[PDB]
Symmetry: D3
Subunit: 149 residues, 6 copies
């Protein structure tokens, strides 16, 4: 079953939005299989944003993502990748639509409180990078039959 | 005044979303004139979904709507039919936008928690099939003057 | 299994608290087995307040519950009667504690938005008085094993 | 960052007060991340209402429009932030609540154009204009938000 | 019935504004069923804060309290209702948030006495005194609630 | 007198995950104003469960406690704050959800002792013991809260 990586950025923790963001995906109906408050070491952050090493904002990006603890999450479900992206909203919170996480709870791209894998491949890549295999938990949801036929 | 039929499907009851769904329409400003937890008979389910009788998924649909009690609702208000449809969201919860009932609380078409009449006449037709004579309660809202000029 | 009668009074409907009240019991973990919006006839009201027919406030009590539609409910669960009473709060909303329904959402005894049976005996009695044959719905809750050992 | 911070006027109309939506509407903007710098419950005089709805004085709904906005107290607000004018308009939704999208204030909480509970300046210029019209000298409160560094670079 | 509608002063302290709880606190009283008749974000002048806490002027913590209550804007409020003074006190909870019971504002949202988010008049006499001190005569807005007949008999 | 910052272990039992209450529980403590310094979805190894419930090892139901806590994933948390241990117990409510008061986690969300959703350390000593037991040595995350000065003097 498809999985995706969702991460509450440092500003989300500082603003006390961890529970609220988790609740949005819980209420949606997806299965949480990985969760941890984590202090991202610089090298791991730089590997995540590897493709942007040549960009002028790279230094700022790394400083930001390591400026405080983040909350790493892995969610499972059919279509979870695209759905999570939709629930999170556009990159720029000002443009993100009301109803989405960034559209309801953020005002600037550089402090857009949360991240979601943009594709199933990046979903697997990110979960493998941020989590240590033994950290994911498998379980049978009692409401499974009522969330999907 | 225009009326529409809104129903919380079996999965909504099992997931304890009855109150939450009702509140969405109450807060919106529409008038609740009919409400009841009901055990849908195969016969009624087949008459309701007659526009899908020839479909291959028709059988699974009938047994699903009868897989548990449902919550029948009749709401009143100018433009309530189209408005409820909008608040409910696209048939496929994965595609329904965040902010709508399905977009916020469901993940699969076969378990999309709620139904809303698609047109005024169908609203009239559905209320007639699901509710009995004096089962509907007509009343005048104290806030009427503040919701409609 | 123990059952209790809970009713949103006319003022609860007028103030749009139907969904909110239902959610409180849904979230608590009890099972909704009966629900309906209903316009209470004078005679049935007087029946409900049988033992208070000699009271000075009897006539006021009767007009109040018949001044608008009410939402009748039947909830099932171990200790649901006493628990429902605790969730509802003191008779006088001013005295009811914050966190309870009346303590959070009402301001006067004469408009205390909701009612709950005061004993298992009155629970059976009240459900038998307000609900007719076949109106109650029994079902097996998917989360039953997670609400009770 | 050198982004330009602007201000917008947001007002809870009489119907918003009657329906007890003041706190809920304020929370939407507070939770969004913008800064509240002006707030007051206010009874709008006919004069101010007409000066505010000047570009509609010729309309047929103007008479009722004025009586509507002065039919009870409103809650005046001034919010600060980068892109707050356009953002507020997005959070509020289409003029007609029936068409406003779920998630927006009017999309979630109103049912008719004439009773669409809230207003937000349509442009940075009208933002300055409206704030200057509804708020008196010294009513606005400037302050430094503790979370400023967490809402904007 | 014929009951006495009193008024009480409720103020969201500087910490409530910094934590973005203005809307949330207002909603608790709106949802309870009381009537908001006065509201304004306000930067409390030092003298006014000293008059408000006049009875504590000799205390060792007084200088620090005045400095604190003037360290950021507050939100002044006037609420009306039968028994609103005692009810507001109950809804707010004990002075020490750690001891305040879950369900109350302080019990749910604060952790320390010095930063307990909101204040409510402790008596009707103080409600009158406080409203008279923080609000200018013409700032209060009286109105008739459409739901009046549904909140009280 | 002034007390030191304290730490407590709060755990969402298997029933909390199954019911999708993880976010809701976290929010109660976040909203309260305490600092989250440890969090993880975890599959409890039997040896750890035994140490956790060591004080009840002589109880006839000890086996049941171990089996249940190891039957499905749990969510481990470490929270910091002055008086956080007693406060968390208060927010959680009485062991029997039927007796727990409305406003508390168990009072609002549970109906049976065996399925009472969450656990909070019963003493500061046990808070430190449990945090060291459930979290690996490098799993805690320390940080300076931007709102610190607004939550406590």
């Amino acid at each position: 079953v498809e999985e995706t990586y969702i991460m509450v950025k440092p500003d989300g923790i500082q603003r006390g939005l961890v529970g609220e963001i988790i609740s949005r995906f819980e209420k949606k109906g997806f299965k949480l299989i990985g969760l941890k408050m984590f202090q991202c070491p610089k090298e791991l952050a730089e590997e995540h944003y590897k493709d942007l090493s040549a960009k002028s904002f790279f230094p700022n990006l790394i400083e930001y993502i390591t400026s405080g603890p983040v909350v790493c999450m892995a969610w499972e479900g059919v279509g979870v990748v695209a759905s999570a992206r939709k629930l999170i909203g556009k990159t720029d919170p000002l443009q993100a639509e009301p109803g989405t996480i960034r559209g309801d709870l953020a005002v600037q791209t550089g402090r857009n409180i949360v991240h979601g894998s943009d594709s199933p491949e990046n979903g697997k890549r990110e979960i493998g990078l941020w989590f240590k295999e033994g950290e994911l938990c498998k379980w049978d949801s009692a409401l499974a039959t009522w969330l999907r036929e």
